[PDB]
Design a protein around this ligand. Structure first.
Ligand SMILES: CCCCCCCCCCCCCCCCCC(=O)OC[C@H](CO[C@@H]1O[C@H](CO[C@H]2O[C@H](CO)[C@H](O)[C@H](O)[C@H]2O)[C@H](O)[C@H](O)[C@H]1O)OC(=O)CCCCCCCCCCCCCCCCC
Ligand SMILES: CCCCCCCCCCCCCCCCCC(=O)OC[C@H](CO[C@@H]1O[C@H](CO[C@H]2O[C@H](CO)[C@H](O)[C@H](O)[C@H]2O)[C@H](O)[C@H](O)[C@H]1O)OC(=O)CCCCCCCCCCCCCCCCC
Ligand code: CLA
Ligand code: CLA
Ligand code: CLA
Ligand code: CLA
Ligand code: CLA
Ligand SMILES: CCCCCCCCCCCCCCCC(=O)OC[C@H](COP(=O)(O)OC[C@@H](O)CO)OC(=O)CCCCCCCCCCCCCCC
Ligand SMILES: CC1=CCCC(C)(C)[C@H]1/C=C/C(C)=C/C=C/C(C)=C/C=C/C=C(C)/C=C/C=C(C)/C=C/C1=C(C)CCCC1(C)C
Ligand SMILES: CC1=CCCC(C)(C)[C@H]1/C=C/C(C)=C/C=C/C(C)=C/C=C/C=C(C)/C=C/C=C(C)/C=C/C1=C(C)CCCC1(C)C
Ligand SMILES: CC1=CCCC(C)(C)[C@H]1/C=C/C(C)=C/C=C/C(C)=C/C=C/C=C(C)/C=C/C=C(C)/C=C/C1=C(C)CCCC1(C)C
Ligand SMILES: [Cl-]
Ligand SMILES: [Cl-]
Ligand SMILES: [Fe+2]
Ligand SMILES: [Mn+2]
Ligand SMILES: [Mn+2]
Lengths: 45, 327, 61, 341, 35, 32, 32, 434, 64, 37
């Protein structure tokens, strides 16, 4: 059951891959200015 | 540029690619390609599928005695119902092919792909700085496809009731749907017919009026299409002349003087019609069938005087008995 | 005991109709709500009183 | 000037409704056809031709009321009111289905008059006559379906009756007796109609979503004026969008509008060819190889064979009431059924 | 059948994660009017 | 039927109550 | 005035239209 | 003026778009629409109780709100029979009377109330771009929703209880003493597959799970409301979303579209939160009831070409499931996933047990099966389940359309080209061809 | 406008009403009344069989 | 069936649920009153 996960090994792609990409995304996120802007969207990128 | 992920994002959302990918395309391309190749392989060489679940398979593949017209990807077995049936949930690959698993694979990946196509149309509209409502127009065929492929099996309880991925299978789906639900008498299919007929009429009318009032920018020895240059800032046809012709063909009041309003109506009419017919299919999936005017006329003695609706019901009954192989 | 309740809720319906017609007209109109501000208060109070009285008499019926 | 010149001047006057020379044919014929259809759907019965009630006087609604085709006893007769069938009797003329012939003939001449009206208005305005060539599509549809098909068949009886449920019955009858969905010309017609609807929707959305910001208002319908020398939408942006979204895009507006004209017209003409083929029972009903395979292999079944069985069911379970003149009497044992196949 | 399932899960998770984190990477700023 | 008459009268009064507000606002020349 | 193309076409539409509306309204109250 | 296209740029048919940047009139419009909803609820409840025929069941009279009130336990006795309609009348009266107050509030805040709120009531004003204030309003309304869920829980456990179809010998109004507060069950329901045989959250088949899940939902909503009141959106959230009224509207639109699809599936399939004594049997329920009635009429007597074990391998109207379990045979094989109270006592570890049907069958089960066979949503009467499912599926689809429209326009307006292409600096003219 | 149309239009509507209520439509258009779909001798559907004797055949069928 | 005291008010209740539709129409009437400005 759960997310179609009838074998524990299936949890390895479902966690390691989202984390790894997130780590890459972290290198993006730390680069961006994370201050408030008070606008409809943030043009700083 | 700043980071590896930033470079990947710049490449994904780049307008310099021959075909725009975008984040919606990141989901659209794999699903659409998978569904395409599985559909081709199944249409060429799939084994026959026991669609009715009573151990009498139906062939729909070219290698099993079908042509292009009669070939189809047979819907999943009635024993499967609407159970999720991937390859790994079948005991063997032969069992998966025998129960119509490739139909479920193609349908699911194709629905994901068309949702990604809607999102990708919006995404490239946003990237180009244009207005985003082309995807709203494209929702109508997507809605119709989801109604004939997903919503109707959900309401009926089996993917075997879905439309087969073929030509003769499509005709069989239409005939069985008419027999079961009398879709011709359903007002939403009537609205869809009005939508498609009006779309054809309005496309022909708009093309005729624009082509009729083409401003002379060419000689007799060449095609008139060369009178228009790509990227030119001037209008290639006289709106006033076409408006006058249309307002003289009918009464003066009936005309679309505003070109933007005319094109908005052109976009609106068939999209609304297809939306209505998709909604009708969705409603009839839960047995909200069309109008029933059977036995609407009787004489003084009480005998039923038949109408054209009675003849339509006779045809529907003739189809119904053939479709139901059981009592 | 039933006729009194029927008359009471009929009066409530009439007062609800009158308030629905009058209150937006009184409030929006620049002329009204200055010489007739208390009329709205009296009408709303009478409406709530009629509601309470109907709820009371519904019990005996 | 002469009398002809003065009449031409009067017919060409800029009135609220243009008359023209073509009006002398269009207005009376179209008016009579529409009035006859209303009269038939309101008062005239089909009891003596089809054994059916099709009129508001008999209790029918908008869907079930129709101007039914003449009786099969009549051949391809013109069914003139003064003709030998009616002999001047209006009641007998209405009872035998002569009002259907009235509507069909005056409506065909009304379509001819409207096509001539399009030609005349195009000539007077001073534009190319790409209307009345687009209308040739509907003209061919009407000629093939309401005129050529019954003429190829036994009588006017098998023509479509002028009604909603009558048209639905005609659809199912043609499917049962001809397998018209399997006809390739009908397939080309379906492709043309669906592609024309697609073109209309996609062109409208593309123009609405590529407009230039020519106004300060959020609602952009006011930003256009007819006396504009500039295009109201960006063709370059639309071409880029559809070239990087679909892989191909229009770059010529004239070619795009000619294509939007051409697709429904070609579809209608192909469907007209298919219906003309049906008129002589020259139908793409069956595939011989598939029938031979199914005959020598009871375990061979495709959706085409299921369609053949469905068409057999429509024919047998409707023949009795759809063709009452034939006096078809089919026992329950001979009626095909899914059970005991 | 398990190896096919793990491959499909890996592929789907990768593509869904790419989609999710791509639309989280300030997608609104990727417009021609951004300064 | 008397109940049909009552339904018609109530429907007429409800349908009148709507435009009556607009008419009164127009008579008093308020913000319409 | 008395005779105009617009006038004649309007009456050719309307005189049958009102006649047919009366006929259909009568059909609505038939015993059927 | 602000009420014309000249001063706003919006035509009359888009006129409520003029309410985006004025707060008081927007609040009045929302309160007026809420009053409309409450008025419809009360009026339709009064209409249904005015047309209620005591002998007929609820699902045979085209009623949709009375089944909702009966599921809550009001005016219903054992077996789903309706005792009195007075509590339904009270519910309708209370809604239709509170509608007057809500309508007055909407009219006041729309017409004569201030157009903007921040200049006079700073505690209620907003800008659609002050993320902290919008999150505070979201948190307050989240607390309200959580308290509503806890109110349903209190009704379930303290005030009267809820109707349960799974009570022995037919459904009955029962107090839910011990709801399922175990997080594993709730998470498994949330993470369950939505396909056939699993059903995701639609397949909740007992009242204890419903009450426990609503406990979790209420407390989670209260906690999230306090969180959003006391916090500000994080850096990843700020850079990902458009911060404007139309964007929030589009988010709500897609949320309610998904909710409408879920509710349509709930009405079509679920027979626990939608009892079959009030909404009628489901389509699978009707088909399986017809098959079970035929099986019973074969076991008794036996002249219907079934007198012994000679036909098939098992008894008549029996076959084996794809996983090997014993199920009802025939065209109803696709509906073997149905679980209904009148058929559960006849089902064992391997499925339907023939001897248990022969001996341990009850007359009320036969009566339920026959009455559900008579009224079939698919066929054997338009079921109220069909009306609810079709209506809310259509609403979900059209609100997905609305979400797409409003989200695209919010993106275009935030970027700044929702009125068209600039024609002075055209974006595609700067891009190189191909 | 309204002066002429306040007399002609209601009179025309009443004439259309009386065209049906007085039974003139059935006589003019040959539409059978609800009590004369099947005669005592002919309980079947009446159908014309010959085109050149259609008038006489309809006279025979509609005589009763 | 309504209670005994409230039976005579069945017609108005029957008119009640279709009131919101009129509200929509009323809005259009208001837009008709101001000239669709
Ligand atoms: C686009 C441009 C046009 C725009 C639209 C114009 C619309 C206005 C005109 C429409 C109507 C035209 C008149 C049609 C009348 C007709 O057809 O009348 C039909 C008659 C023939 O009548 C039929 O004749 C048949 C054969 O009979 C013969 O054979 C029988 C055998 O048993 C008997 O022996 C019988 O006595 C003997 O006469 C049967 O008897 C039928 O019952 C009988 O109806 O032909 C005739 O009058 C004349 C035959 C000469 C040909 C003229 C028409 C050609 C059109 C195609 C005709 C169909 C061909 C197949 C199309 C697919
Ligand atoms: C995301 C993927 C969308 C497709 C997944 C499958 C959708 C579906 O089959 O949904 C069905 C499920 C319910 O599933 C059913 O759930 C049932 C639960 O009933 C069980 O439990 C019940 C408890 O009372 C009863 O006891 C009953 O007897 C018992 O069988 C059964 O398990 C059935 O086998 C099972 O099929 O709904 C749900 O999970 C909620 C999901 C709703 C999805 C709505 C359709 C998807 C959106 C289409 C939009 C198209 C238009 C836009 C185009 C652009
Ligand atoms: C544009 C005008 C127009 C046209 C093209 C037609 C055409 C037609 N009508 Mg229609 N009709 C019209 C006006 C018109 N009508 C009007 C104004 C009336 C009202 C009085 C009618 C009433 C009417 C009836 C009641 C019927 C027709 C029928 C017909 C068809 C047979 C014609 C025929 O053989 O008549 C023969 C007569 C002529 C062709 C007249 C020609 C005169 C010649 C050219 C002059 C020379 C005469 C000579 C020197 C002596 C034909 C399709 C019949 C039909 O097919 O219905 C099924 C039918 O029953 N028409
Ligand atoms: C339920 C839906 C709904 C709601 C709540 C609103 C609400 C509002 N609209 Mg919108 N609108 C709607 C539908 C809706 N509209 C539709 C469908 C259209 C298209 C036709 C419009 C078109 C539209 C435009 C074009 C504009 C608005 C504007 C407004 C605002 C003020 C209107 C005004 O000046 O009233 C004036 C109306 C009157 C004086 C007459 C009606 C009087 C009252 C309201 C009748 C209520 C009857 C009720 C029974 C009374 C109960 C009394 C109580 C004590 C019980 C208000 C917030 C305007 C605005 O503020 O923009 C800035 C504006 O410009 N709307
Ligand atoms: C849920 C939606 C909603 C919201 C956010 C508001 C918000 C507001 N209303 Mg409105 N109002 C509403 C519904 C709403 N009202 C309804 C349903 C009615 C009908 C009873 C009213 C009737 C109303 C009136 C008559 C007045 C307000 C006023 C106010 C303001 C002050 C209220 C205050 O301090 O609380 C009070 C808090 C309490 C705990 C009091 C308990 C009661 C504030 C902007 C006042 C104002 O001037 O602002 C325009 C004012 O005079 N409201
Ligand atoms: C209507 C209710 C509501 C709304 C509009 C919001 C809105 C918001 N919240 Mg809040 N929140 C809520 C309720 C709500 N919250 C509740 C009840 C809780 C308690 C659990 C929280 C706890 C919470 C935290 C702790 C945080 C937010 C944050 C946010 C912001 C970004 C959220 C985001 O990107 O989603 C992201 C969504 C996902 C990653 C998807 C998760 C889905 C989970 C795994 C369940 C999946 C179920 C199912 C399998 C898939 C969906 C099926 C569907 C059909 C139901 C946004 C302002 C964030 C923020 O910036 O604020 C500071 C943040 O950090 N919220
Ligand atoms: C909670 C939901 C919600 C909210 C608050 C809004 C709010 C808004 N929308 Mg959005 N929208 C929604 C849902 C929503 N919409 C959905 C679900 C759809 C898909 C159908 C749309 C499609 C949509 C479009 C296409 C547009 C908007 C626009 C607007 C704005 C102006 C609306 C207006 O003036 O109405 C005016 C009201 C009318 C003209 C009345 C329409 C009546 C409909 C067509 C009849 C439907 C049948 C009816 C219910 C049955 C009654 C029968 C009766 C006729 C007898 C406003 C910001 C417009 C805008 O300015 O964008 C910012 C715009 O262009 N919306
Ligand atoms: C399939 C894959 C599904 C992935 C779901 C993604 C949801 C959003 C994840 C962005 C997560 C992300 O990478 O953004 C992290 C974001 C920016 O990170 P930086 O690299 O600038 O690091 C700053 C530090 O505070 C560490 O976060 O940090 C914040 O906004 C404040 C702390 C919030 C931390 C996250 C709390 C909420 C996370 C919800 C999970
Ligand atoms: C409510 C409703 C819902 C949806 C919207 C809606 C559609 C707008 C609306 C419908 C409203 C409705 C119901 C509208 C209906 C309108 C109607 C019924 C109009 C009827 C017109 C009749 C005509 C023109 C007949 C003329 C007779 C002629 C020419 C005779 C010809 C003769 C014949 C027989 C042949 C021999 C020759 C002669 C003698 C010449
Ligand atoms: C085509 C056309 C023509 C012109 C242009 C157009 C405007 C666009 C269009 C209009 C078309 C149309 C058809 C416009 C029609 C518009 C109409 C008739 C609108 C009527 C609205 C009535 C309302 C809102 C009643 C509210 C009463 C209440 C709440 C009180 C109720 C009750 C009372 C008795 C008291 C208490 C009990 C209860 C039950 C509560
Ligand atoms: C703002 C806006 C601007 C322009 C556009 C717009 C849409 C036109 C407008 C919206 C305006 C809007 C939407 C305004 C909103 C208006 C609303 C929803 C008004 C509600 C009125 C309900 C009443 C009076 C019912 C009272 C019930 C009673 C007395 C029950 C009695 C019962 C008792 C006691 C016992 C039993 C019997 C009964 C009789 C049944
Ligand atoms: Cl079949
Ligand atoms: Cl069966
Ligand atoms: Fe165009
Ligand atoms: Mn089915
Ligand atoms: Mn069937």
């Amino acid at each position: 059951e759960a997310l179609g996960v009838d074998d524990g090994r299936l949890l390895v792609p479902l966690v390691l891959i989202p984390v790894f990409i997130a780590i890459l995304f972290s290198n993006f996120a730390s680069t961006q200015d994370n201050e408030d802007f008070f606008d409809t969207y943030d043009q700083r990128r | 540029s700043a980071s590896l992920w930033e470079r990947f994002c710049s490449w994904i959302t780049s307008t310099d690619n021959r075909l725009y990918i975008g984040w919606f395309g990141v989901l659209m391309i794999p699903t659409l390609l998978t569904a395409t190749t599985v559909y081709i392989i199944a249409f060429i060489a799939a084994p026959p599928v026991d669609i009715d679940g009573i151990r009498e398979p139906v062939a729909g593949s070219l290698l099993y005695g079908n042509n292009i017209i009669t070939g189809a990807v047979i819907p999943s077995s009635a024993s499967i119902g609407i159970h999720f049936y991937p390859i790994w949930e079948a005991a063997s690959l032969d069992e998966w092919l025998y129960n119509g698993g490739p139909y479920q694979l193609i349908v699911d990946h194709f629905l994901l792909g068309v949702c990604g196509w809607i999102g990708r149309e919006w995404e490239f509209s946003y990237r180009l700085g244009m207005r985003p409502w082309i995807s709203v127009a494209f929702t109508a065929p997507v809605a119709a496809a989801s109604a004939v492929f997903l919503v109707y099996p959900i309401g009926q309880g089996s993917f075997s009731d879905g439309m087969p991925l073929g030509i003769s299978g499509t005709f069989n789906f239409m005939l069985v749907f008419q027999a079961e639900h009398n879709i011709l008498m359903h007002p939403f299919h009537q609205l869809g017919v009005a939508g498609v007929f009006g779309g054809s009429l309005f496309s022909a009318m708009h093309g005729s009026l624009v082509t009729s009032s083409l401003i002379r920018e060419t000689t007799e020895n060449e095609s008139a299409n060369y009178g228009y240059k790509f990227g030119q800032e001037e209008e290639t046809y006289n709106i006033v002349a076409a408006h006058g012709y249309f307002g003289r063909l009918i009464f003066q009041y009936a005309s679309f003087n505003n070109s933007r309003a005319l094109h908005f109506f052109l976009g609106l009419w068939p999209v609304v019609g297809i939306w209505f017919t998709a909604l009708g299919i969705m409603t009839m999936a839960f047995n909200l069938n069309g109008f029933n005017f059977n036995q609407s006329v009787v004489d003084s003695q009480g005998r039923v005087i038949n109408t054209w609706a009675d003849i339509l019901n006779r045809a529907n009954l003739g189809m119904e008995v053939m479709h139901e192989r059981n009592a | 005991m039933v006729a009194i309740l029927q008359l009471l809720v009929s009066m409530l319906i009439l007062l609800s109709f009158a308030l629905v017609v009058s209150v937006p007209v009184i409030l929006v109109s620049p002329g009204e709500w200055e010489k007739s501000k208390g009329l709205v208060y009296t009408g709303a109070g009478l409406w709530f009183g009629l509601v309470i009285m109907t709820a009371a008499f519904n019990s005996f019926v | 000037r002469g009398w002809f010149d003065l009449m031409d001047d009067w017919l060409k006057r800029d009135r609220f409704v243009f008359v023209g020379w073509s009006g002398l044919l269009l207005f009376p014929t179209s008016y009579l056809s529409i009035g006859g259809w209303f009269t038939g759907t309101t008062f005239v019965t089909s009891w003596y031709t089809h054994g059916l009630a099709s009129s508001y006087l008999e209790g029918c609604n908008f869907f079930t009321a129709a101007v039914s085709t003449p009786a099969n006893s009549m051949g391809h007769s013109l069914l003139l009111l003064w003709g030998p069938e009616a002999q001047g009797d209006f009641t007998r003329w209405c009872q035998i289905g002569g009002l259907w012939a009235f509507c069909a003939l005056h409506g065909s001449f009304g379509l001819i008059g409207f096509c001539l009206r399009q030609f005349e208005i195009a000539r007077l305005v001073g534009i190319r006559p790409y209307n009345a060539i687009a209308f040739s599509g509907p003209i061919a549809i009407f000629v093939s379906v309401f005129l050529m098909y019954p003429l190829g068949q036994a009588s006017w009886f098998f023509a479509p009756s002028l009604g909603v449920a009558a048209i639905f019955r005609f659809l199912l009858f043609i499917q049962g007796f001809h397998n018209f969905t399997l006809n390739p010309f009908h397939m080309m017609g379906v492709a043309g109609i669906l592609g024309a609807a697609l073109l209309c929707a996609i062109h409208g959305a593309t123009v609405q979503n590529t407009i230039f910001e020519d106004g300060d208002a959020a609602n952009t319908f006011r930003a256009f004026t007819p006396t504009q020398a500039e295009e109201t939408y960006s063709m370059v942006t639309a071409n880029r969008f559809w070239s990087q979204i679909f892989g191909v895009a229009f770059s010529n507006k004239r070619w795009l509008h000619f294509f939007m004209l051409f697709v429904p017209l070609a579809g209608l003409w192909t469907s007209a060819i298919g219906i003309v083929g049906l008129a002589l029972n020259l139908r793409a009903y069956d595939f011989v190889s598939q029938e031979l395979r199914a005959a020598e292999d009871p375990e061979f079944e495709t959706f085409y064979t299921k369609n053949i069985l469905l068409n057999e069911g429509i024919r047998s379970w409707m023949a009795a009431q759809d063709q009452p003149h034939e006096n078809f009497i089919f026992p329950e044992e001979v009626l095909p059924r899914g059970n005991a196949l | 059948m398990f190896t096919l399932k793990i491959v499909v899960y890996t592929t789907v998770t990768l593509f869904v994660s790419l989609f999710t984190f791509g639309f989280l990477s300030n997608d609104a700023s990727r417009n021609p009017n951004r300064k | 039927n008397l109940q049909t008459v009552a339904q018609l009268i109530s429907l007429f009064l409800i349908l009148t109550s709507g435009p009556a507000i607009i008419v009164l606002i127009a008579l008093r020349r308020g913000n319409l | 005035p008395i005779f105009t193309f617009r006038w004649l076409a309007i009456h050719g539409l309307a005189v049958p239209t009102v006649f047919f509306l009366g006929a259909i309204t009568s059909m609505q109250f038939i015993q059927r | 003026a602000g009420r014309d296209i000249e001063s706003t740029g919006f035509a009359w048919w888009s006129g409520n778009s003029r309410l985006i940047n004025v707060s008081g009139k927007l609040l009045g419009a929302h309160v007026a629409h809420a009053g409309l909803m409450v008025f419809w609820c009360g009026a339709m409840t009064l209409f249904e109780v005015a047309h209620y025929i005591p002998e007929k069941p609820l699902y045979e009279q085209g009623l949709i709100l009375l089944p909702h009130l009966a599921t809550l336990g009001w005016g219903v006795g054992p077996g789903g029979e309706i005792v009195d309609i007075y509590p339904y009348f009270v519910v309708g009266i209370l809604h239709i009377i509170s509608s007057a107050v809500l309508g007055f509030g909407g009219v006041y805040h729309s017409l004569i109330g201030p157009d903007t709120l921040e200049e006079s009531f700073p505690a209620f004003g907003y800008d659609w771009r002050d993320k902290n204030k919008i999150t505070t309003i979201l948190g307050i309304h989240l607390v309200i929703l959580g308290f509503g869920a806890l109110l349903l829980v209190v009704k379930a456990m303290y005030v009267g209880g809820l109707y349960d179809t799974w009570a022995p010998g037919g459904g009955d109004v029962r107090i839910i003493d011990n709801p399922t507060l175990n997080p594993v069950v709730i998470i498994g329901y949330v993470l369950k597959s939505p396909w056939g045989g699993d059903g995701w959250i639609v397949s909740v088949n007992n009242m204890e799970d419903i009450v426990g899940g609503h406990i979790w939902i209420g407390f989670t909503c209260i906690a999230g409301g306090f969180w959003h009141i006391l916090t500000k959106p994080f850096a990843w959230a700020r850079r990902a979303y458009v911060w404007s009224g139309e964007a929030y509207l589009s988010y709500s639109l897609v949320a309610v579209s998904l909710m409408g699809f879920i509710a349509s599936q709930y009405s079509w399939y679920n027979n626990t939160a939608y009892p079959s004594e009030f909404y009628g049997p489901t389509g699978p329920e009707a088909s399986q009831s017809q098959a079970f009635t035929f099986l019973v009429r074969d076991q008794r007597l036996g002249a219907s070409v079934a007198s012994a074990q000679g036909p098939t391998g098992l008894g008549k109207y029996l076959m084996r499931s794809p996983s090997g379990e014993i199920i009802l045979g025939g065209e109803t094989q696709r509906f073997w996933d149905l679980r209904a109270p009148w058929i559960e006592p006849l089902r064992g570890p391997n499925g339907l047990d023939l001897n248990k049907i022969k001996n341990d069958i009850q007359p009320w089960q036969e009566r339920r099966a026959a009455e559900y066979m008579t009224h079939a949503p698919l066929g054997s009467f338009v079921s109220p389940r069909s009306w609810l499912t079709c209506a809310h599926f259509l609403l979900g689809f059209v609100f997905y359309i609305g979400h797409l429209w409003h989200a695209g326009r919010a993106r275009a307006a935030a970027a700044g080209f929702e009125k068209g292409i600039n024609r002075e600096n055209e974006p595609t003219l700067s891009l190189r061809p191909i | 406008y309204w002066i002429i149309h306040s007399i002609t239009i209601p009179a025309l509507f009443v004439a259309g009403w009386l065209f049906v209520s007085t039974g003139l439509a059935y006589d003019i258009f040959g539409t059978p009344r609800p009590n004369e779909y099947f005669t005592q001798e002919r309980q079947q559907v009446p159908l014309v069989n010959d085109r050149f004797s259609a008038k006489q055949e309809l006279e025979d069928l509609t005589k009763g | 069936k309504l209670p005994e005291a409230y039976a005579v008010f069945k017609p108005i209740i029957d008119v009640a649920p279709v009131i919101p539709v009129f509200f929509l129409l009323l809005a259009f009437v208001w837009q008709a009153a101001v000239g669709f400005r």
